[PDB]
Amino acid sequence: HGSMISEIIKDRAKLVNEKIEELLKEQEPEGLYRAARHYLKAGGKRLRPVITLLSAEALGEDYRKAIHAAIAIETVHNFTLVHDDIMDEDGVKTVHTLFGIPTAILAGDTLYAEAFEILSMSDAPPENIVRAVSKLARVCVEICEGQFMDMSFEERDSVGESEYLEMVRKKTGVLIGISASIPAVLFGKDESVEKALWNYGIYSGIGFQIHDDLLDISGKDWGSDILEGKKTLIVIKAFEEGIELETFGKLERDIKKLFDCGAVDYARERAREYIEMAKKNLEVIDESPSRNYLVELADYLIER
Amino acid sequence: EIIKDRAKLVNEKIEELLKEQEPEGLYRAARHYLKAGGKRLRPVITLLSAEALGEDYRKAIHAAIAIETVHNFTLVHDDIMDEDEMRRGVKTVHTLFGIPTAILAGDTLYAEAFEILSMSDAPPENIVRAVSKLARVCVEICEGQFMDMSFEERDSVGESEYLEMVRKKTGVLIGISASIPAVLFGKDESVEKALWNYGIYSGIGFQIHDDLLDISWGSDILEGKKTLIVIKAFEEGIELETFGKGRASEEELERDIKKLFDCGAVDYARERAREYIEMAKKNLEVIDESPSRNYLVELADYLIER
DSSP states (O other): OOSOHHHHHHHHHHHHHHHHHHHSOOOSSHHHHHHHHHHHHTOOOOHHHHHHHHHHHHTTSOGGGGHHHHHHHHHHHHHHHHHHHHHHOOOOOOHHHHHOHHHHHHHHHHHHHHHHHHHTTOSSOHHHHHHHHHHHHHHHHHHHHHHHHHHHHHHOSOOOHHHHHHHHIIIIIHHHHHHHHHHHHHTTOOHHHHHHHHHHHHHHHHHHHHHHHHHTTOOOOTTHHHHTTOOOHHHHHHHHTTOOOSOSOOOHHHHHHHHHTTHHHHHHHHHHHHHHHHHHHHTTSOOOHHHHHHHHHHHHHHHO | OOHHHHHHHHHHHHHHHSOOOSSHHHHHHHTHHHHHOOOOHHHHHHHHHHHHTTSOGGGGHHHHHHHHHHHHHHHHHHHHHHTOSEETTEEOHHHHHOHHHHHHHHHHHHHHHHHHHTTOSSOHHHHHHHHHHHHHHHHHHHHHHHHHHHHHHSSOOOHHHHHHHHIIIIIHHHHHHHHHHHHHTTOOHHHHHHHHHHHHHHHHHHHHHHHHHHHOOOHHHHTTOOOHHHHHHHHTTOOOTTTTTSSOOHHHHHHHHHHHHHTTOHHHHHHHHHHHHHHHHHHHTTSOOOHHHHHHHHHHHHTTOO
């Protein structure tokens, strides 16, 4: 076909959730685990584990073997969400709001260890598990560096485009990068193939972020990110050519200036560039239904 | 004893594997305690346990650094929770750098530990098991810290609940310190459980003694920390005048400390702490006699002597 991508995401997400329920059961101490399972139970697009399972399939493997890696990465993601929410302080209600900050910190730390425990249950050669552990951990370190950078940007008045893109790469790209590349690691695929899936993830993630930030201008309210002063690629290119907007303390006038300077279309062109780059990296992989799903998925990430 | 030797090795590997890096903000925070220089107890237990198994304990160094990294991770997040302004002789991480950076710093140490563990020179099969066991250990420390903090607001907790909390909060990380060389080098379940049980019991006793060292001042009771002493005494219905206050008079706290010695409760702690360290030794017997094996013995002793 070529138009079922929302249905494949759905199908694989449904698998992800079924195994989430199997592997991340609520336990004692009940207060820790209710915080620990909160975000997971409120749902999630499950985009990263879905990518893992599509990548696994596109590599000619039984993608059920990739479930653990898939859920570990979704577990890492959920963990970052809990801790991140502690630091934006701003639904559903955040975990630190419902359970307090200590329970929230320990809830993230719990999910964090479980991620690795789950990944280690993978049905794959130990040498590859050890490499997947090493690689996921390095990604975790990078996400913290990305989160740190992103917060630094809140205190800065002059964030460069490349700095910002570097931030997004760690904050959003690398986790998506390893959800595409981890079945390569687990199943002994070689370096050029892992590299192709990694780049696919990173470039999808970066573009996915740019488009996400475009949706703030193209439930929640128009121009939210503007009044909250968030540095997006759009904002950064407008500043880059001295547009300087009359909100940033929490409007429709500002939004016109962003289109008028082409900063909105710069960001679109940047996000599409990233997704084309992500798709060209897939060329290394054998054509298959699953490879085309990954291709259409990159498209979806920026066309929704 | 001969620990400053391995303590020396561990800090050399720490400075080799846990470099500062960019963003310097994040790593200045993440290396703050490591540079402050803890006693490195658990790493030394890992190197000695390895040599007691008659292995090349240098091969166990990555697991030694990894467990110390976990330990430092917990310190950072714990200090956020207790809102301590200082830990031993240095300001806490959240106070110098802020709560969000403190969170990210421990989150970074946390991942760094699994990356270091995975570098081990051992059968990969056994690195996987080591990652699985250390990650469950980390889940339990979190379960413990949540238990310990839940205790604060409870009116009374039994010795059992409290001792299950100490087993998770500070014991299992000490158990896996000794356990992990048995895991890494394919010793069998008897040996693992033996080094495991030694590490846990050493932990609990080590904890009970660390609560005694505050009676050895005063802060545990003003802070309301529920120790094994105050659980015995309160089980003995000992009216304790200054347990909640935080601010207190010297005479008021002295009469509360005075009570506690005379309760038949400070004795209980030393005694109960001692029957744990002994349970560690009598467990450690499954391992062959060795300079290393007796070193773990004398070391389980040092946890009760301070």
